[model samples]
Target: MKRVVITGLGIVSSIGNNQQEVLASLREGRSGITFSQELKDSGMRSHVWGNVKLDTTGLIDRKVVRFMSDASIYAFLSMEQAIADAGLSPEAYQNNPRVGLIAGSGGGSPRFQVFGADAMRGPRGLKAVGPYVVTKAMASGVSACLATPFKIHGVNYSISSASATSAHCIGNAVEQIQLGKQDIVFAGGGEELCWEMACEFDAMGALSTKYNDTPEKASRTYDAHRDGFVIAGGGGMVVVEELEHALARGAHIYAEIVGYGATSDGADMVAPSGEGAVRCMKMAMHGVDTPIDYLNSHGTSTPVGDVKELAAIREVFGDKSPAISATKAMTGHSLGAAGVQEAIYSLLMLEHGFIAPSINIEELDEQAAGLNIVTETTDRELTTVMSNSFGFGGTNATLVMRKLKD
Candidate 1:
C-alpha cells in the first residue's frame, strides 16, 4: 500500500474560522457555545448553540454562490485555504485527473430546503423558488461545489454518515490514494447552522437544555451535569496526498495517515453498541506497533454518548490508556464537519507538542474519573494519536496518525 500523509489543513468552526485562530482557541480553552434566543423563541428546550461568526460574502463568485448553501460555501472556503497551505497552485489541480475531491454533509442545507418549500407553497408558486434549489439542496452539494470550482475530475464524490461524514470521506480519500487511484484528494465535510436543523434535533431530544443561560458550560463533555450535544455549524478540509507525490513537491507534511477503520453496528439506529467502537479501534491499530499517546474523542457531551465512548476506549486500550480529550466541549459538535475538525485539532496538537483540554468539565463523571482525561492544556511529545467519530446510525470511524519519521 502506498503511504498517505496530510500536507495541508483548513477549518471553519464555532471557535475560529482559520487554522491559527483555532489553534489559539484550543490552547486557551475557549468556549464557542452561545445563547440562542431564536432557539428559545422557537420552543426548543436547548437554547444554547455553538454558532459560527463570519462574513462569507464575496468568497465565491456570485453565480456560484447563488447555487450554494452555507455548507457548500464553508467547504469551498476551507478547501481553498487547504490548497493554498499545501502550496498548490490552481494550475496544478485544475483539470488534473490525478487530483480528486470527496466531501459532503450529514444533511444538505436544511435552511435552503425550508426556503424552497416555502416558496413553492406561497401564492407566487414555483416561480418564487429559484432554479438553484435542487442543486443547493442535494446531499452532494458541498462536493459538487468543491469539484466544480477547481475542475477536479478524478473520483469526485461524497459520503453521508451523519456525524461520521467527514471521517468516512477522509478514510475513503486515503484509500483512493493508497490504491493509486489519485495522487492527491481534498476530503472533508461541512454543515449549515439553522433552526431547521436544530429544531429536528430538539424534537429528537438530542440537544443540551440545562445551561441555556450559560451556553459555554452547556456542552459539558464527560461531566456529571452533562445533558446533550450543542449543535454547531462549520466545515473542515485536509489535503491528503501520496507520500511520494508530496515529497517530490517539497510539501510540508503535517502528519502521516497510517490507519483508518470504519464499521457499523447493525443492531442500533441511534444508541451505540460499544462492541462496534472497540472493533473499529482495533482495526485501526492492526499494523501499528507504537502505542497511541493521545486520543481525540467523539465526546459529544450527550450523557449516553460520552459514557459509552469511554467504555469503548477502556475496552480497547485497557486501564493505562493514552491521554484523552474531546474538542467538542469547546467547538460544540459541528455535525458533518466534526470528524475533520477533530482530526485537524489532533494534527495541530501533534505538531505543537501539546494536548488541548476538554473544557466545561466542572465535575468529571465518576465512570470516566479513572481515565487520564485532559482538562487543561499541557505540553507533551506526541508520537501517535487517534481521532474517532461515531454517528447516529451506529456508524463508527477511527483514524490513527503519527509524526513523520525518517
Candidate 2:
C-alpha cells in the first residue's frame, strides 16, 4: 500500500475564508457564531448561526454557478484553493485518469429543494422548474460539479454520512491512494446556511437557543451550560496524494495519513452510544506506534454529544489522554463539512505546533474532569493527532495523521 499524505488544504468557514485567516481565528479564540434574524423570523428556537458569506463573482463562471447551489459553490471554491495550494499543474490533473474527487454535503441543497418544490406548487407548475434544479440539489452534486471543471476521471464520487460526510470522504481518499486506484484525490465536504436546514434541526430540538443575544458564545463545547450545537455552514477540502507522487512533484507535505477507522453504533437513530466511538478510535490507532499528542473532537456543544464524546475519549485514551479541544467551539457545527474542517484544523495545528482553545466554557462539564481539555491557545509540539467525526444514523469516522518524516 502506498503511503498517503495531505499536501494541501482549503477552507471557508464562519471563522475565516482561507487557511491563513482560519489560523489566526483559531489562535485568537474567535467565534463565528452570530445572531440570525432570519432564523428568528422563521420561528426557529435557535436564532443564531455560523453563517459564511462568499463572493463567487470572479471565482466561478456564471454558467457553472447557475448549476451550483450554495454547497456546490462552497465545495468548488474550496477545491480550487486546495488544488492551487497543492501546486498541481493542469497537466497533472486535466485529462488525467489518476486524479479523482470525493466530496458531498449532508443534506444536498435544501434551499434549491425549497425553490423547486415551491415552483411546482405554484401556478407555473413544472414549467417554472429549471432543468438545473435536479443537478444542483442532488446528493452527488458537489462531486459531479467539481469533477467536471477539474477534469477528475478516477473514482469520482461522494459519501453522505450526515456530519461525518467529509471525514469519510477524506478517509476514502486515503484508501484510494493507498490501493493504487488514484495518485491524487481531492476530498472534502460542503454545507449551506439556510433556514430550511435549520428548521429541521430546530424541529428536532437540536440547536442552541439560549445564546441568541451573545451569539459568539453560543458554541459552548465542553461547557456545562451547553444546550445544543450551533448550526453552521461552509466547506473544507484537502488534497490527498500518494507520498511518492507528492515527493516527486516536490510538494510541501502537511501531514501523513497514518490510519483511518469508520464504524456505526447500530443502536440508535438519534442518540450516541459511545461504544462505536471507542471501537472506531481504537481501530484508527490499531498499528499507530507514535503517541498521539492531540485530539480534535467532534464536540458539537450539544449537551448529550459533548458528554458522550468526552466519555468515549476517557474510555479510549483514559483520563490522561492527549491535549484535546473541540474546534467547533469557534467554527460551530458545519455538519457535512465539519469532518474535513476539523481535519484541516488538525493539519494546521500539526504544521504550526499549537493547540487552539475551546472557548466559551464558563464551567467545565464533569465528563472532562481529568482530561487535558485545551482551554487556551497553547504552544506545543505535535507529532501525531487524531480527529473524530460522528454523525446521525450511528456513523462514526476517525482519522490519524502524523507529522511527515523521512
Candidate 3:
C-alpha cells in the first residue's frame, strides 16, 4: 500500500483563518464563540457561533459570487490556502489524471431556505429564485467547484456525513492513494450556519441555552453545566499526497496518515452508541505499531452525545483514554467541517510539538472528569495523535496522525 502524507493544510475556523492564528488561539486557550443577535432574532435560544469576519466578495469574483453559496465560499477560501501552502501550481496538475478532489459539507446552500420558501409562497417568487439553486445546494457542489477550476478529472466527489463528513472524505482519499488510483487528492469539508438548521436542532432540544448572554462560555465540553453544542460555521482543507510523490517533489510533509476507521451504530438514529465508537477507534489502531500519545475527541458538548463518546473511548482505550482533549470547546462545532478542521488542528499540534487545550471547561462532568482534558494551556512534544468525528445516523470515523520526518 502507498503511504499517505499530508503535504499542506488550510483552516478557516471560528478561532482563526490560518494555521498560525489557530495555533496561537489554541495555545492561549481562547474560545471563539460570540453572541449573534442574528441567531437570537431567528428564535434560537443560544446565539453563539464561531463565525468568520471576512467578506466573501474580496475572495471571490463578484460576477460568480451570486451563484455560489456561503458553504462554497468557505470551501474555496480554505482550498486557496491549501493550494498555496502545497506550492501546487495549476499548470503542474492540469494534465495529471491521478490528481483528484474530494470534499464534504453539511449545509450546501444557506440561501435555499429563504429563496425556496419565498418561491413556494407566490407565483412571481419562482422568478426570484436563481438557476444555480440545485447545483449550489448539491452535497458535492464544493468538490465540483474546486475540481472544475483546476480541471481535475479523477475521483471528484463529496460526502455528507454530518460532522464526520471530512473524516470520511479523508478516509476515502487515503484508500484511493493506497489503491494506486490517485497520487494526490484535495480533501476537506465546509459548512455555513443556517437559521433553518439551527431551528431544527432547537426544536429537537439539542442546542445550548445557558450562555445566551455570554456566548463565549457557552460551548463547555466536559463541563458539568454544559447543555448542548454551540453552532459554528467554517471550512478546512488538506493536501493528501502519496508518500513517494511527496518525497520526490520535496513537499513539506506536515504529518503521516497512519490509519483510518469508520463504523455505524445500527441501534440509534439520533443518539450514539458507545460500542460503535469503541469499535471505530479499535479498528483504526488494529495494526498500528506506535502508541497513540493524544486524542482529539468528537466532543460536541451535547448532554447525551458527550457522555456516550466518553464512555466509548474509555471502553476502547481503557486507561489510555484519559489523555484526550476536546477542541469543540474552543471552536463551536463546525458540523460537516468539524472532522477536517480538527484533523488540521491535530496535524498542526503534531508539527509544533504541542497539544492544544480544551477551552471553557469550568467543572468536568462526572463521566468526563477522569479524562486529562487538556485545558487552560498547551503541552509539548506530542508525536502521535488521533482525532475522532461522530455524526448523525451513528456514523463514526477516526484518523490517526503522526509527525512526519524526511
Candidate 4:
C-alpha cells in the first residue's frame, strides 16, 4: 500500500484563525470559551460557547456571501489555505480530476431556521422558498461550493458522524490515496453553531453549566468538576497526499497517517461507551511498533464521557501510559470538526517537539492521574501520536500518525 502523508493544513477555530495562531494558543494553554449571551437569552443551561471569529476582512463579495451558509465559507477558507500550504499551484488543481475534497460537518444550516419558519405555513410553502435554499441547506453544500473554485471532480463527498465527522473524512481520504483513487485530496470538516443545536445539546444535559459566567473555566476536560462540553464552532482542513506525490512537489510532510479505526456502540444514543472506545483505539494503533508518545483524547468535559474514555485508555495501553491531553480545553468541542482539528494539533505536536497542555483543570481526575494525562505543556521530542474522536449514537473514529523520517 502507498503511504499517505499530511503535507498542508488549514485551521479556523475559536482560539485562532490560522495555523500559527492556533499553535501558539495550544502551546500557551489559552481558552476561547466565552459566555454566550445568545445562549443566556435563549434560556440555555450551558451558556458558554467556542464560537469562531471569522475575519473575512471587508466582505466585498456580498452577493456571493449572502447565499452561502457559515459552513460553506469556513470550508472554502480552510481548503484555500490547505491547498496553498501544500505548495500546489492554483493552476495545478484547476481541472485536475485526480484531486478531490472531502468536507464533513454535523450538517446544520442556519438558513434552515428562516426557511423552516417560512415553509411550515402550507403545502406549497416550499414553492415560496428562495432559489438558493437548496444550495445552503444540503449537507454537501460546503464541498460542492468548494469544488466550484478548486475544480475537484474526483470523489467529492461529505461525512456526518457527529464529532467523528472529519476524522472519518481524513481517514477515508487516506484510503482513497492508498487505493489509487486520487493523488491529492483535501479532507476536513466545517460547522456553524445554531440556536436549536445548542438548545438540543443543552436539553440533553450534554453541555457545561457550572461556569457560564466564567467561560474560561467552562471547558475543563477530564476534570472532576466538569459539567459537560462547551458547545463550539470552527473547523479544520488538511492536504493529504501520497508520499511519492508529496515528494514530487517538494511538499513539507507534517506527519504520516499510518492507521485508522472506526467502530460503533450499538448500546447508546448519547452516552460514551468504554467498549467501543477501546476497540477503536486498539484498531488504530494495532500494528504500530512505535509507542504513542501522546494521545489527543475526545475529552468533552462531561462527567461520564471523560471517565469512560479514561477507562478505555487504561484497558488498551495498560502500563505504557501515553501522554494524553484534551485539546478541547482550549478549542472546546468543534463537533464534526473536532476530529480533524485535534489531528492537526496532534501532527503539530509531533512537528514542534512538545505536548500542548489540557488547560482549566484545577484538579485532575484521580483515574487519569496515572495515565500520564498532560495537564501542563511539556517540552519533549515526540514521534508517534494518536487522536480519538467519538460522537453521538456511539460513532467512534481513531487516527494514529507518526513523524516522517528523512
Candidate 5:
C-alpha cells in the first residue's frame, strides 16, 4: 500500500485570504459573516452572506481575467499558493505527466450563466454576449485552467457533488496516488457566490433571516438558537503527494490521509438521511482503532440537518466520540468549497494541536448534548482528526487524517 500526505494548504474565505490570516481569526475568535451586498437591490429574501475579499490581480495575471470565470481564477490562485507552500519549483510543476489536478466543483458561477442566458434572450441575441461566455459558464473550465500552469495531464477532471464536492475530489485523488496512478495530486474546490444563488437558497427557506440586522450572528451552528447557514463564496486546496515523493523534496507534512469514505443517502436531493451519514462516517474510519481527537463537523446550522448529523454521529461514535466543531459558523457555508475549506482547518487543528470553536454558538442544541463542542477556542493535543461533508442529492463524504508518526 502506498502512503499519501498533505504537504501544503491554501485557502480563501470571508475571514482571511492566507492561512496566517485565517488562523489568526481562529485564535482570536473573529467572525467573518456579513450582510450580502449583492442582495441589497436584488430583492432576495435573505441578505446574509460570507463575502470574501481577495486580490486576484496579485495572484493571477490581469490579462487573463476576461478569458476565465471567477471560479477558475479562485481555483488557480488557491493552487498557486499551495504549490509554493509545497516548495515545488516551476520546472517541477510544468512538463509533469506524473502530477494531477482534480477540481471539485458543483455549480460554476450560475450568476454568470444567468447573465449570458439573459443577454442572448434580449433583442441583440448572440451578438450581445462576449466570446468568453462558454468558458466562464462551463463546469470543467476551473479544472482545465490548471493545466497550463503546471502542464499536469494525469487524472484531470472536475468532480461535482454539491457541497461534498471537495471531499470526494480529495478522496479520489488520494486513492489514485495510493494506487500508484500518480506521484502528486492537487485536489480541492472553489465557489462563486452570486445574487441568483442567494435567492435560490433563500427560496428554499433554509437561510437564517433573524440576524440580518447582525450578520455576524446569523450563522449559529450546533446551537439551540440556530436558524440556518449563510451562503458564502471562497476556495481551498491542499497539495497531496506520495510519502516518498514528498520526503524526497523536503516538503513539510501537514497530515497523513489514511481513510476516505463516500456513500449516498439513496433518498433525496436536498434533504440528508442520518442513516447515510452514520454509515459514511463509520466507513471512513473502518479498521482504524485510533480514537479520533476531533471531528470537523458539517454542521451548517440548519435545524433538521444539524440534528440529523449529530444524531447520526452520536450513533456511530457512541458516548466517546471526538470533540466536534462546526466551522461554518465563522466562515458561513461556502457551498461546494465547504469540504476542502473545513479540511484545511482540520489540518490546521492537527498542526496547532487545537480544535477551532463552533463560533456564534450560544445555546447548545439538546440533541447534540454531551458532545464536547469547543464553544471557546481551546488547546488540546490531537493525534487524529476527521472531517465530514454532506452535499445535495444525499451525497456524503468523510475523510480521516492523522498526525504522521513515522
Candidate 6:
C-alpha cells in the first residue's frame, strides 16, 4: 500500500480560522460558545455556537455565489486555504488525473427552506431558486466546486454521513491513494448551523438550556452541571497527498494517515450503541501497527451520549484507553463538519507535542462512564493519536494518525 501523509490543512471554526489560531485555542482550553440574538429571534433555542461572523462578500464571483449555500461557501474558503497552504499551483495538478476531491456535508443547503418557500410562491420564486439548485445543494457540491477551480478530472464526490461525514471522506481518500487509485485527495467536511435545525434539536430536547445566558459555559463535557451540546457551525479542509507525492513536491508533512474504521449501529437513528463505537475503534486499531497515545473523542456533551461513548472506550481499550480529550467542549459541536474539524485538531495536537484539555469540567458527572478524561492541561510528546466522530443514524468512524518521522 502507498503511504499517505497530510501535506496541508485549513480550518474555519468558532475556535479560530487557521491552523495556528485553532491550535492556540485548543492548548489554552478556550471555548468559542457565544449567544446569538439572530438565533433567538429565528425561533431557535437561545443556545450558544461557534459561528463565524465574517462577511462572505468578495470571496467568490457573484454569479457563483448565487448557487452556493453557506455550507458550500465554508467548504470553498477552507479549500482555498488548504491549496494555498500546500503552496501548489492548479496548473501543476491539472494534468494529473489521479488527484481527487472528496468532501462531506450534513446539511447541503443552508437556505433550503427559503428556497422551497419561494418556489411555492410564484414564477419569480422559481427563477430565484435557479436551475443549479440540485447542483449546489447536492452533498457533493463542495467537492465539485473545488475540482472546477483546479480543473481536476479525477474521482470526486461527497459523502453524507451526518457527523461521520468527513471522517469517512478522509478514510476513503486514504484507501484510494493506498490502492493506487489517486495520488492526492482533498478530504474534509463543511456545515452551516441553520435556525430551523436548531429548533428541531430543541424540539427533540437535545440542546442545552442552562447556559442560555452564558453560552461559553454551556458545552461542558463530563461536567456534572452540563446540560447538553450547543449548536455550532464551521468546516475544515485537509490536503491528503501520497507520501511519495509530498516528498517529490517538498511539501511540509503534518502527519501520516495510518488507519481508518467506520461502522453503523443499525439499531437506532438517534441513539449511539456502545458496542458499535467499540467495534469501530477496534477496526481502526486492527488496521494500524502503532500504539495510540491520545484520543480526540466525539464528546458532544449530551448526557447519555457522552456516557455511552465512554463505556465504548472502556470496552475497546480496557484499562489502557489513551488519555482522552473532547474538543467539542471548546469548539461546540459542528455537526457534519465535526469529523474534519476534530481530525485537523487531532493532527495539530500530534504535530505540536500537546494534547488539548477538556474545558469546563468543573465537576465530573457521577453518572458518566469512566475514562481518563484529560482535564486541566497537559503537554507531552505524542507519537500517535486517534480521532472519533459519530453522527445521528448511528454512523460511526474512527481514524488513527501517527506523527511523521524518518
* lDDT winner: 1
Once fitted onto the true fold, the runs of candidate 2 whose alpha carbons sit more than 4 angstroms away are none
**Candidate 2 structure, TM-score to reference:** 0.98
Q: Write the per-residue lDDT of candidate 4 for residues 270-301, one digit (tens) a residue.
A: 89878999999889988788998899999998
Say which prediction, candidate 1 or candidate 5, comes out ahead on lDDT.
1
- Per-candidate Cα lDDT values, in order, are 0.92, 0.91, 0.84, 0.85, 0.85, 0.84
- TM-scores of the candidates in the order shown: 0.99, 0.98, 0.96, 0.95, 0.97, 0.95
TM-score of candidate 6 versus the correct structure, residues matched by position? 0.95
How much lDDT does candidate 1 score? 0.92
Q: How close is candidate 1 to the true structure, as a TM-score?
A: 0.99
Give the per-residue lDDT digits (tens) of candidate 2, residues 7-54.
988899988899999999999999888899999999899999988855
Cα-based lDDT at residue 97, candidate 1:
90
Clash counts for the predictions, in order: 0, 0, 0, 0, 0, 0
Candidate 2 has an lDDT of 0.91
Model 5 residue 29 CA deviation (Å) reads 2.0
Pairs clashing within candidate 6: none
* Residue lDDT tens for model 1, 213-309: 8888999899999988999999999999999999999999999999899999887899889889999999999998899999999999998999999
Candidate 1 deviant stretches above 4 angstroms: none
Candidate 4 lDDT at 18 equals 84
Q: Mind sharing the TM-score for model 3?
A: 0.96
Q: For residues 1-406, write the lDDT of model 3, one tens digit per residue.
A: 7899999888888989888899998888788888888888988777777787566667777655555677777887898899899989887666578998889798676557567767767776767665767767777777877777667888899988888999999999999999999999999988877776787777888889988888888998888889999888888999999999998988999888998999998988888987889999988887777888889999998889888988888788777663678889888888989999999988888888787887777778898766777775666777778999998898999999888753
lDDT of 3 at 147: 76
